[PDB]
């Protein structure tokens, strides 16, 4: 991964989370579970939707296109016609396959980027109040309840309120 997150320092994905691409999985005293991040998932959905739509827009539908007949004294024109149809076919096959290979690479990295950025939005909120294990997990110090867990995914954590460390 270009961003070292997916298949990186976060070794695997969660079949458990099913309401988004990126999200969290907390611990609590009040139980465990998964949660999707509307912010970063919707943002990714909009983007990828636009990429697909954009790629398709640049491919204009092929209207009526029929071959032509030539008599036995027009072989030169016939080969010319063939050379043109094959020329264009070669180019459009190349473009299509090539664009997809490239936007697939960029797409995977786009997700890898969103995960890292998400892991960092969290890490930049918590700071001292928790320590970084690995696997993209944070070990709290101040005992965080469901309402506190929410404030994290909410982007409203209120760091100045912990020192129970």
């Amino acid at each position: 991964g270009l961003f070292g997150a997916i298949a990186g320092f976060i070794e695997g994905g969660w079949t458990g989370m099913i309401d988004g691409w990126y999200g969290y999985h907390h611990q609590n005293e009040q139980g465990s579970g998964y949660a999707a991040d509307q912010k970063s998932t919707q943002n990714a959905i909009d983007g990828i939707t636009n990429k697909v739509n954009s790629v398709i827009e640049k491919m204009n539908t092929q209207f009526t296109a029929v071959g032509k007949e030539f008599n036995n004294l027009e072989r030169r024109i016939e080969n010319l016609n063939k050379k043109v149809d094959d020329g264009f076919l070669d180019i459009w096959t190349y473009n299509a396959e090539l664009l997809v290979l490239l936007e697939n690479e960029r797409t995977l990295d786009f997700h890898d980027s969103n995960v890292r950025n998400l892991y960092e939005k969290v890490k930049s909120q918590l700071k001292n109040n928790a320590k970084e294990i690995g696997n993209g997990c944070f070990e709290f110090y101040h005992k965080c309840d469901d309402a506190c867990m929410e404030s994290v995914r909410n982007g409203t954590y209120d760091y100045p309120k912990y020192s129970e460390e």
Partner: protein, 324 residues
Amino acid sequence: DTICIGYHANNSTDTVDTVLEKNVTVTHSVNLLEDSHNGKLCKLKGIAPLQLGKCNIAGWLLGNPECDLLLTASSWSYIVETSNSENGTCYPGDFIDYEELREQLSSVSSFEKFEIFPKTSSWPNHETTKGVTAACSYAGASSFYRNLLWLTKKGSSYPKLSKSYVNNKGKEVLVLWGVHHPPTGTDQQSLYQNADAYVSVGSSKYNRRFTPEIAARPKVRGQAGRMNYYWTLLEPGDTITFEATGNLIAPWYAFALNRGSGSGIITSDAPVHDCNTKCQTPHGAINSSLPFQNIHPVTIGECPKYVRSTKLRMATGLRNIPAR
């Protein structure tokens, strides 16, 4: 007390390719390459295609006896020839600018077949029967093109003829005629008398004279003679004058044409069916909103861009890693 940031995974098996890596299973994706087709030839905007069947453009327009199924035709969404469309020119000869005529037809959605020079009224001084040949027979019976009239001498007297049609149909009229070239001076005499005959065809834009090329050739369908076929598009208001002292295979029926884009000629052995499509290929129809397809380069209607690829799967989701 912990919180973990992670990403989605599932039982997806879809694979996409990238420049750095091949076969990467992803959580979501879209296929952009349409590869399923109908296998049938279908209507387009409610209109059916014109099945030529055993005939080709030549047989159909000229009026080859074996193409009588087609005499009723008037409108069509597109034209179809098959592996067995060999019935065209039955009396041996060159169809002059035949290809150009096909190309013209590709942009025709309909016409009105009409009797330009009526057989039993246009030639008082010439023989309008006896103009048949074994070369163009149906059911062992000497016949001839349904749309051309083979004029011959009326009792050792083939007088100079002059016939003009004024095109007032408000549309392009397709006129077809032929020029006969007997194998010997004898045959030339029996058919037209007049060993030195000529055919003179003229309109506002078309001018050309024909003299018989008399010579012995290998026999094609039992004929050493030959018959050249010609055509022109008379414009609205324009007149066409036929002048001959023999050898003229006069026009009997012509076609007032209706222009219309989006049409064309294809070669398919697929069965016609009662269905409506927006895209048609020689292999069948296509009901698809995808951008690409690898079914066929030949296309009629609003179709996906043809491409040589076998796989065009574009990733939308992230790398899929469940790790059991």
